Amino acid sequence: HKNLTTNQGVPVGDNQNSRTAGHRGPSFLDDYHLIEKLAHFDRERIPERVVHARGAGAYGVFEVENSMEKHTRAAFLSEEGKQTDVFVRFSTVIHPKGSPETLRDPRGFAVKFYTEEGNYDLVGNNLPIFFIRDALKFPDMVHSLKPDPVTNIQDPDRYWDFMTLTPESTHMLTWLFSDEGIPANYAEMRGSGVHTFRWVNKYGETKYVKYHWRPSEGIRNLSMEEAAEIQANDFQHATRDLYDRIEKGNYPAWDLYVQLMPLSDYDELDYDPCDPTKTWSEEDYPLQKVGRMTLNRNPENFFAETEQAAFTPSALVPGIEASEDKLLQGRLFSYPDTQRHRLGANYMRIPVNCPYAPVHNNQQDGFMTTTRPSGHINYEPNRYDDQPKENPHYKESEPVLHGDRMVRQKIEKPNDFKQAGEKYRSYSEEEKQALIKNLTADLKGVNEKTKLLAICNFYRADEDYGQRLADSLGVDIRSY
Amino acid sequence: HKNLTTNQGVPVGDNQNSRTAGHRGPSFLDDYHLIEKLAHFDRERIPERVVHARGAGAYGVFEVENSMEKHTRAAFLSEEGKQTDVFVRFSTVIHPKGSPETLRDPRGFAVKFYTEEGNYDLVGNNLPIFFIRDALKFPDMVHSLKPDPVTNIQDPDRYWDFMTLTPESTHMLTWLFSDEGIPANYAEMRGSGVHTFRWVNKYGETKYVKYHWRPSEGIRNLSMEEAAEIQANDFQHATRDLYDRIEKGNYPAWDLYVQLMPLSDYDELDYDPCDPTKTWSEEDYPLQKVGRMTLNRNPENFFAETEQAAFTPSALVPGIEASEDKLLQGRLFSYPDTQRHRLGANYMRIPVNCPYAPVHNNQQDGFMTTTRPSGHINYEPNRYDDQPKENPHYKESEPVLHGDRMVRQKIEKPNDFKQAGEKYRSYSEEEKQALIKNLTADLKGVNEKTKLLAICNFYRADEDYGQRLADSLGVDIRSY
Amino acid sequence: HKNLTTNQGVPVGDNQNSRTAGHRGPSFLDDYHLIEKLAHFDRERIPERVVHARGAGAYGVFEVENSMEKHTRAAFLSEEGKQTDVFVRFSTVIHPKGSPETLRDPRGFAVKFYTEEGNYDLVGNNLPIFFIRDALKFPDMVHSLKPDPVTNIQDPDRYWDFMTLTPESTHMLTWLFSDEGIPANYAEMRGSGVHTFRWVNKYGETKYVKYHWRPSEGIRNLSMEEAAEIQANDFQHATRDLYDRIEKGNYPAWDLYVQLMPLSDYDELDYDPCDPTKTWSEEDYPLQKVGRMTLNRNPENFFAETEQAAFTPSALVPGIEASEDKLLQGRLFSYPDTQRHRLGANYMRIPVNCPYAPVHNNQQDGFMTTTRPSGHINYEPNRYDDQPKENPHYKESEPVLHGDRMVRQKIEKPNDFKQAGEKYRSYSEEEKQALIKNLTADLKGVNEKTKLLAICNFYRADEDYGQRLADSLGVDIRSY
Amino acid sequence: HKNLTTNQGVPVGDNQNSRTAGHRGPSFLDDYHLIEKLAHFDRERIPERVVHARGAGAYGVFEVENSMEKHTRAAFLSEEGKQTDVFVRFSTVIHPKGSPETLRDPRGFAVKFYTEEGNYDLVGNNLPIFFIRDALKFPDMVHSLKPDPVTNIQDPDRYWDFMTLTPESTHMLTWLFSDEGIPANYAEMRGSGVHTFRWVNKYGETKYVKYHWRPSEGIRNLSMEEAAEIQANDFQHATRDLYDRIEKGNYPAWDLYVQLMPLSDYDELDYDPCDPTKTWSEEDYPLQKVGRMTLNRNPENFFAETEQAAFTPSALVPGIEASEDKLLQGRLFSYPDTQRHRLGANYMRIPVNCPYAPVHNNQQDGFMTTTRPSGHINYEPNRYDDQPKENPHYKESEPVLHGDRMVRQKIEKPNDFKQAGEKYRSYSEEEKQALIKNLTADLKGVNEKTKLLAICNFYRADEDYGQRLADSLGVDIRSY
């Protein structure tokens, strides 16, 4: 047995009645319990994530099968058998916190590894490419996909406007409007790092790397009609499914694979290997197994752990570095920036975000300082040998720069249509049919000039793709 | 034609490419446009409302048909034909932004009248009673109804635990589990002030009042299966319907009716007229027509106007006062409290929240001061005749107190079951069948002791009600 | 030895150089250490206290000498020898955080007692009365005293305007413009609860109480000229002195005394005993020794402990209750209200604010949830015997109300001048001269009508007082 | 005459008395005016600036005397006679709001020019160099100079520790410890841009530039004894002086001069011309007159205009660009970053911060959206010709990069001591005496090892300088 108390630690005598002028009179201001309890209630909510607002989290373990020390000095990958705790959040993208998990969207696949040399965040999605290749466009892209700012309803005319005029999107759309646009749940789902990263070994040698997560539960997708039928009765079915698997002891897992490419292959290719609208051939750059992640524990409190979880692509660890991918570059900034707003200056002290590795630095203060700071020395350099010092063993690599000027200029070899055609042609006939069906349902109401431009983009990917879509939309494209 | 600019007013030379080391290198910190645009994007979201997070707004006009000056000095009600502008937000209650509008819930019905003596907010719901009668219980009620804090899924076993142990909820639950728990949309829906308020006339005479809104479009509800059919294909169907009606010129309207009761009728009733778990008889206190509200304009920007709208039951105008209702009393505090957090100290300067009536006072400063303040005098009393002064014509009434001590104690005559039985018996056979069906579906998985207590509460309301529910649940109540 | 790390726990290779395009080129975005370190720096500050911004804190112990159980059930006062930990902040009032401690002002004397039945805050000042007697006036008062909102400089013409038109201020001003308006430092200083409170014993019997702190170091003040001499060379002399005393083991101490008055003495007096512009006679209501507080430890971090400390007059413990004093009644609200803005919704989790007593309740979430919450049950009533429950042993008293209506009306027997005259007459001739000197320096530049009203208010206190001030100001009051 | 009103626009009947249970009873919760008024009071304060918290602002006009079109295409400098409105804030650096203006510190000299092509901020200080040359060190530098995080008192042992170990500081200290470390006020004070910037003309040709402001009132400084004398009687003498000059029509003015250097001069100098610890010889790069700024108008509200004013070095206009200076580079980030925290995401809508030039972009929402947004299109590219578009006439230059690799490495030719010696030797004998006096008073209580290192640093600047300091400190440096 325990007393109900105020936040001052005073036991509460009555948690049923406000203090009033007799049993039926108006309420008095001197009711600390009422005021404190209402005021805290009044302040429960914090801003939702600007994208990926809807999601679900779980803890688990990653275990190395094949050590990667020949390619990366990353401590958590250094030895067979080595286990690292993780926290993972899965999500949709566009709609708000309470929105259904049956909508078409990429799914987020955000892993925080609690390594002995710091937290490593790999902030992936299920689909392995993106719509755009420069972060400057992200707010535009998002605003086009988001509910209309007048009506609060998503409008395909808006996002198809932006996407058609951003033809690098063509490959992504070709995946998003397959039925993999609606994964059956979070467990039966791919994961991808999307970007190329740099792995740097103890000798300072660099490779390009791509990450891939392969579900032990297999990949399964929903048709539009299957998604609708689930939506009718459950708007949180993927959150449900994840919690339930774990509660039952049926732990979902993914095998981690990487591809590795020499920096010097840039000139051997007809696309930029750091363009995130591109994949790398699995034939030319085969998948190499690293290990397995198993999710085996639900959080204790959804708000404190899942809703307040903060992941950033810039939470890198020694031996793993950003590539020059311009989309990735902006992310390095935007996540910690949004997290300071959403969660507070000290969000890194929220338990789920805390490293296992020691934190020692000269940062101080900020809202909600709860860590019991002490000491006179909050600056470096200083004269004290016992105060924290830099450690040059942990310097990052020095990538070579090929440019001689500060420029704003698109990459060379953008090659916006080729891989979209290759993906189209890789689909089974059933999959192609589902693609055309999903695209047609989405495009049929949009502005005619935009609709034509969409058809033309997919035609450039593959003539059959474009012609089928034109036919299904009742657009005559003879004349182009 | 317009230039795209930064917030500094500098025209943007390139809104496509980040600034980089050559055409494919890493990104530079000196890209003010990139950083300003990402940083503002990163800060678009603010906290959703703690309850009623999902909703939709519209503007319109209220016109008086019968002047109410005999009963209230309220300026906006003073004469036939008088028109006052309104803003109205409709909502669900429990689930977040983005959640479907097909869920079972009260609906919010919040009206802001822009009067010549200040803004008057009548912050209603569709249903005319509430689950509880003291604001001290509101965070408890809400937390039981809200998604489980571990699973993020709503759990009937949790809110039924609370409700069964809070038998004053029995009347409300008898309305909420009729099909009126799922209105067809926001236009074909009842509105209620719920609480008794006080109307005070120019002679200082007070009457108790209840407000009622009657839809010109009729009341229409959804069965569970009708709601599921809509939910399959649209999770924002009520927001859609409202916008579309107005955009088409098919303006929805509601007639405003009041009931009026002498203060002296308290003592002879077998309930407390200021208990918000009670209605008043429409035979004994007939509905009296006041006027009509027509909604005829969608907002220009959903965030700025609908999301940032702030209503409070304490936004009262001369001639309309709070009653002693202990649930109302807390609301008077909680709304402007939460709004300071959700919207900022200066939320009353956000355009939708601004009065039409002049605002002059000695308040100052606060986050986001945008009003161009001036003058040396921000204190009263002062020696300056031209500075704002109090006006004793606008004093509120002096309600009589019946109590002689500061107490925490339940009202007399709580009478938790009688009106629930009267409501049950007023249902058609089809409506009773739907009630029992909706209750059974909700209760069938809850803890057996809780399920029994629920049955017993509805049995006390009406023996046929309780026995039918026991039967439908397969629960043997013989030994009770 | 320790590595300097990021907040992710990654050791920092170089804490001297930003990452750049060669050794002299512009800076890259991909510099997580730079951006994290600057972004946290950029957010170090929180709002200062709206008043009492400048202050200093220390920890100590309070020890009971005479148990008070005959008069109050307060646990921390229950036994001779009983020790309770404290945290104390001393302060000036009007000017901002970095302002000098040599200015004229009341001094704050805020004591947080970490009791076994919760935190008790006695939020006092040095001077034993106040300017005003209703919280509605506090923003006005403060705005008049604060730097002019145009010039950022305090103007006596502004606060004398207010004070002269608020004649209840006369007693306070008679103490404030003695040399006790500038204490020599925070150790050689009086402390007062100011308000009357209610003490309730285990039988439910109530007495009125007044609290007084008497410094072991004696009371010592500065003249205007002595204060200027200190200010020339140190603008934080009192903060310095407190820290230095404690660091060198010269712990400052205060003896706590109370006065006790029956509720039934209200009619026996020519002032309202809950008017905080009044003191109680030490002859008629003798000082009774309670115990001693010794301050013996400086904080480890000033921001985390002193700057983030939150005290409230509403942090009452069983056996100690508010009186009806209308100034105190507003304070009960204002302190936790401002603290939620200044410090966050979860400010009660910041270590210095945490109780020693257990905290268990159903509150949740809010910015910066750092406490590792768990469990499914966040609502009461509930079916679970082990969850926290109310404890009726801890109900507060039920004060009798003498009013029969809700009114806005000044107290009876305001008696604004009598005690001011008594205080004036209690001064030595030297002290009277210092009072007249200090008043004259302050009033000599103000508006002539205001200056005459000030003279008239002090005349009504005592004719000699008024006449001396009129003489010193060159104002002829013979015509009146 | 005006009514005092609530923020709802309801006239207030009584601004003196809270609502209570009879004339002396406790206070009621149903007192919207009391609560609204206390709650806004409770929220008046925002965080102070992390540095330069103490300051004062004024408006004025800048007039071009000599067009600068040979060297920059900046619109505001394009024609003789062209007038641009400005807002200017002057400040100290280290201590909080409220702190004295008689302390040793650089002073801030921040000018916002409201140009036809956007707001241009030149965020200067009086002294023309800085302590450090990389932004990564700024929080360290500041934390060393700030009050000790334990004692809340500035400690020379702390900042001398940092500075001695940061020998690039030697030139700055040789200025700061002249009497120019304490300007007499803000009007009789130098201004400097400190950094090298880039000026780009209509042909795309670039020069390096430095900015200098020369007071029409002449430069005047305070000795330590003069500063103490002012501090005794006034802790805000500079804020007072600036206001008072303007109020009386004695407008202070500064002439703007520039120095111009070819980019190609880098390679021939024995220092880096973008090292902000360095000045450029006025013999080799003569001062060239641009125009004059006159400050002629005080703000109407200090909080809304001066306290909320936001300047950034990244508020550049066409023809004026950042240089590669690594200290400047980090400022480009830090200012808008802190401002979003201190002021809100929408701080650029606060009136003092608004451009005169039109703002049109696709940003949206954020706390306190007051600007009445409208329209369906908040994304680019889009199909609408009338929506805002990029304008390639306004592209910035493409600076050449001399580096091969992303590196963390000190600039070449740091040359930490030469210019410090030159400055020393340029002082009059009186000025050298004052320098040594001021240094000696600061260093005499510092740790011996630190004190010796300081002496050594100044000795390397100039043997006489170091030896005089050592002699004054009683340190025998013969052995070295």
Ligand code: HEM
């Ligand atoms: C320039 C491109 C992008 C920008 C600017 C961007 C920005 C953001 C921001 C601001 C958030 C909210 C973060 C938070 O509140 O902590 C977010 C969430 C997220 N984004 Fe992105 N994003 C971009 C591209 C991508 C890409 C390529 C992926 C996947 C490869 C991705 C996956 C995610 C995921 C999974 C989340 C949710 C993380 C979580 O579960 O907590 N985004 N993004």
Ligand code: HEM
């Ligand atoms: C990396 C070096 C520096 C950093 C990181 C930095 C950072 C900051 C920050 C965060 C502020 C607060 C701004 C606000 O809240 O609006 C500030 C204020 C200021 N700093 Fe710096 N600063 C640096 C160097 C300098 C330099 C070299 C100068 C002058 C040349 C300078 C002059 C100022 C001034 C004048 C202000 C006051 C602006 C105002 O009146 O609002 N700072 N600094």
Ligand SMILES: [Cl-]
């Ligand atoms: Cl922020």
Ligand SMILES: [Cl-]
């Ligand atoms: Cl650090």
Ligand SMILES: [Cl-]
């Ligand atoms: Cl006011």
Ligand SMILES: [Cl-]
């Ligand atoms: Cl708040």
Ligand SMILES: [Cl-]
């Ligand atoms: Cl609670």
Ligand SMILES: [Cl-]
């Ligand atoms: Cl934009």
Ligand code: NA
């Ligand atoms: Na009439």
Ligand code: NA
């Ligand atoms: Na005793």
